[PDB]
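User: Could you write out the 3D structure of this protein bound to 1RG? I've included everything you need below.
Assistant: Certainly. Input first, then the structure.
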Amino acid sequence: DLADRFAELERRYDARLGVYVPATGTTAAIEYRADERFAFCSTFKAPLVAAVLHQNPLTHLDKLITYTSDDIRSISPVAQQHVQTGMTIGQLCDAAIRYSDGTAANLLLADLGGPGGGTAAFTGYLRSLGDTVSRLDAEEPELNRDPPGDERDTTTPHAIALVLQQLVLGNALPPDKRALLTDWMARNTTGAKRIRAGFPADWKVIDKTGTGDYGRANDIAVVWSPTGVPYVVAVMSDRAGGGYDAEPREALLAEAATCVAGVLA
Ligand SMILES: *C(=O)[C@@H]([C@@H]1NC(C(=O)O)=C(S[C@@H]2CN[C@H](C(=O)Nc3cccc(C(=O)O)c3)C2)[C@@H]1C)[C@@H](C)O
């Protein structure tokens, strides 16, 4: 039984696990703690890129953004190298999704603009997609640090799955912008040990991970079966029992995804 298996994983990893897969044509929704809040961590970067894409002409991707030493405040594998040159909006989107670059995310939030350095406009974008649950309150690095249970900077597996479904499978974005987002998620470098690890090789997986304090490890994905049937998979986890420095456990997400894949096969 799936709920029993997910509970077993919680005990194995001393973790809290949330899973949602929306209903499709012939499969019921899969849900485990799906309406409980979990920190976004870096998973917000996927809808952030969608918001920036939606807000601007496509060739806004070519606008050069400059930034300085004091902008590097979080894990930023790409932006750390480009303080002198700057990065275009398209380079920032690429880095935010594929390398989970925190500075890139902060600069994209500032591009979106408005109160809270763009966090309010990001939340507004989610509201426009019918998500009345999620909220972004801080930027990097603070957004990963809220204590367990705090509602700041949270989504739920259910809410983020429905947002991702609209972005990738629905009509939230026009086809050209949709393809940009999908391709960046398809080319993600950070997700091999999470949802990808749970699905057979002949299933396509595109994803955005998140990792944070209190042992937080998330992954949001769209998967496609070998015959082109898509499913959205959101897995979120934390480990409050280990305190602030608890190790995130990718293995928990790989096991949870393996269980989901067995149901979807
Ligand atoms: C956003 O959440 C966050 C950055 N994003 C991600 C992410 O996974 O998307 C990370 S983590 C980074 C990429 N994958 C590696 C990883 O998962 N390492 C890992 C996994 C499990 C345990 C450990 C450990 O205990 O050391 C390490 C590393 C990155 C933090 C920022 C922008 O806030």
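Residues 223 and 231 are 5 Å apart (CA to CA).
User: Perfect, thank you.
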